[PDB]
Amino acid sequence: GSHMNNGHEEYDVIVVGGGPAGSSAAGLLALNGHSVLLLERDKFPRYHIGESLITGVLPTLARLGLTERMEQLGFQRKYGGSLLWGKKPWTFKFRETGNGKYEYAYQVRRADFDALLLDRARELGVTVLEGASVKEPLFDGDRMVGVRYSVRNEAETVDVSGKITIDATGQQRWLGRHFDMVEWHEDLRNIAAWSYYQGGLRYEGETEGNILTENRPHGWLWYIPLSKDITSIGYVTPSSRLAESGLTPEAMLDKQIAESSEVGRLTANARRVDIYRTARDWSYVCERFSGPGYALVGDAAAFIDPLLSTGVTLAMRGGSTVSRAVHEALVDPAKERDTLQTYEDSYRDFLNSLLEFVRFFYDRTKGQKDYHVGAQAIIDPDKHFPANVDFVTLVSGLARGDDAVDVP
Ligand SMILES: Cc1cc2nc3c(=O)[nH]c(=O)nc-3n(C[C@H](O)[C@H](O)[C@H](O)COP(=O)(O)OP(=O)(O)OC[C@H]3O[C@@H](n4cnc5c(N)ncnc54)[C@H](O)[C@@H]3O)c2cc1C
Numbered sequence: 001g002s003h004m005n006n007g008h009e010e011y012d013v014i015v016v017g018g019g020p021a022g023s024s025a026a027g028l029l030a031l032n033g034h035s036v037l038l039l040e041r042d043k044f045p046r047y048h049i050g051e052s053l054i055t056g057v058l059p060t061l062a063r064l065g066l067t068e069r070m071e072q073l074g075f076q077r078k079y080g081g082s083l084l085w086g087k088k089p090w091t092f093k094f095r096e097t098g099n100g101k102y103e104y105a106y107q108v109r110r111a112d113f114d115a116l117l118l119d120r121a122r123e124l125g126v127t128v129l130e131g132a133s134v135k136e137p138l139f140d141g142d143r144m145v146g147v148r149y150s151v152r153n154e155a156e157t158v159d160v161s162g163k164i165t166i167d168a169t170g171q172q173r174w175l176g177r178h179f180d181m182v183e184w185h186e187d188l189r190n191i192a193a194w195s196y197y198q199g200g201l202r203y204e205g206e207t208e209g210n211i212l213t214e215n216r217p218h219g220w221l222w223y224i225p226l227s228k229d230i231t232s233i234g235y236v237t238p239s240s241r242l243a244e245s246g247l248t249p250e251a252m253l254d255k256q257i258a259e260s261s262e263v264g265r266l267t268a269n270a271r272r273v274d275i276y277r278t279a280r281d282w283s284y285v286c287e288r289f290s291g292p293g294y295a296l297v298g299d300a301a302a303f304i305d306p307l308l309s310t311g312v313t314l315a316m317r318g319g320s321t322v323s324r325a326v327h328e329a330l331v332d333p334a335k336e337r338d339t340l341q342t343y344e345d346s347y348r349d350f351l352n353s354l355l356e357f358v359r360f361f362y363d364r365t366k367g368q369k370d371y372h373v374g375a376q377a378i379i380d381p382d383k384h385f386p387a388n389v390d391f392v393t394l395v396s397g398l399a400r401g402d403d404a405v406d407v408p
C-alpha cells in the first residue's frame with residue numbers, strides 16, 4: 001500500500017497566506033497564466049492592524065487592476081504625513097517626488113483592503129481556500145514539493161503538490177519558524193497598544209487624510225483618519241519602557257493620548273469606540289528568502305517597525321517582485337535558484353534603506369532638515385536630488401530604478 005491522497009491536486013504555485021503579500025503574489029502569478037492555490041486560515045474580511053499606506057503600493061494596485069476600485073470603495077485619500085518629531089507638526093506631501101505623479105495613497109481598514117485584494121486574486125484565477133491552515137511543508141530531499149494543510153473542523157489533513165511554495169504568512173513566520181532562521185532585531189523590541197475613536201478632529205483641505213505621528217518622551221503616537229468619524233490611535237514604545245512604568249499597555253495608551261500635545265488636542269471631544277489591542281516583537285529578517293521549491297515574501301520574510309508605515313508597501317512590492325521571480329523560475333527551472341537569489345538581493349536593498357532610516361528617525365534629537373539629509377545619505381549619497389525629494393522618495397516606499405516601486 002501507499003499513503004494515497006483522495007482528490008490529489010497539483011499546482012504551479014502554492015501561496016500560504018492571503019494578506020497583501022500573498023494575494024498580490026498569487027494574483028500576479030495567475031495573470032501570468034500559472035495555476036495558483038492560495039491557502040488562508042481565516043475567513044475574509046478579517047480584522048488586521050496596519051492601516052496607513054504610502055505611494056509605493058500604487059504600482060502593484062495598478063498591475064492588479066485595482067486603481068479605480070480603491071476610489072469606488074471610498075477609502076480615505078492620504079496626500080502626505082504630519083510629524084511632530086524632533087527638536088507644531090512639520091509635513092511632507094507625496095507629490096514632492098516623482099514629478100508629482102503619485103499625489104496620494106490611502107488610509108485603509110485592513111479587513112476591507114485585504115478582502116479587495118484576495119477577491120481580485122480569485123477573479124484573476126487563483127484557487128483561494130479559506131479556513132485552510134498550512135501545518136508543514138512537504139519535501140523531496142531538500143526541495144519543497146507541496147504542503148500539508150488542515151481545514152477547520154475537518155479531521156483529515158490534505159497534502160497538495162506545488163512546484164514552488166510561497167510563504168506569505170506574515171508575522172506567523174511559517175518558514176522562518178520551520179527552518180529556525182529568524183534573525184531578530186534585538187534593538188527593536190517594541191509594543192504597540194491601540195484603539196479606535198469617534199469624534200477626533202481633522203486637518204483642513206488635502207491634509208485631512210494625513211497620518212500624524214507624534215513623538216513622546218519614551219515612545220510615539222499614531223493618529224490615522226480612516227473616515228470622517230473614525231481615527232485609529234496607537235502608542236508604540238520599547239517593551240522595556242512599558243515594563244519599567246508598571247502600567248498596562250491600555251493604561252499607557254490612555255495616559256499618552258491625554259498628555260500629548262497634538263493628539264491630545266485632536267481628541268478633546270473624542271470617545272474610544274472599540275476594544276484595546278496590542279502587538280509586540282515584530283522586528284526581524286529571515287536568514288534566507290528562498291530555497292529549492294520555496295520563497296518567502298512580506299512579513300514572513302522581514303518586518304521593520306510601524307514608524308513611517310512601510311509594511312504593506314514592503315509586502316506588495318514583495319508580491320510584485322516574487323511573482324516576477326517565480327514566473328521566471330517556472331519558465332526556466334534551471335535558473336530557479338539564481339532568480340530567487342536575485343529576488344532576495346533586491347528585497348534586502350530596499351529593506352535595508354528603510355531599516356537604516358527608521359533606526360535614524362528614532363533619534364528624536366534631530367530636526368526636519370537633519371532627517372531629510374539622513375534620507376539623502378542613504379538613497380542618494382551623490383546628491384542627484386534635493387534632500388527633501390530624497391526624504392519623500394524613501395518614506396513613500398519608492399526606489400529609483402526598482403521596477404516594482406519606481407519613482408514616476
Ligand atoms: C502595530 C502595527 C501597526 C502597523 N501599521 C502599519 C501601517 O500603518 N502601514 C503599513 O503599511 N503597515 C503597517 N504595519 C505592518 C503591516 O501590518 C504588515 O507589514 C502587513 O500586514 C504585511 O502583510 P502580509 O501579507 O505580509 O502579512 P499579513 O497581512 O499579516 O497576512 C498574512 C496572512 O497569512 C495567514 N496565515 C498565517 N499563517 C497561516 C497558515 N499557517 N496557513 C494559512 N494561512 C496563514 C493569516 O491569516 C494572514 O491573513 C503595522 C504593523 C503593526 C504590528
Ligand SMILES: [Cl-]
Nearest residue numbers: 306309310311
Ligand atoms: Cl509598518
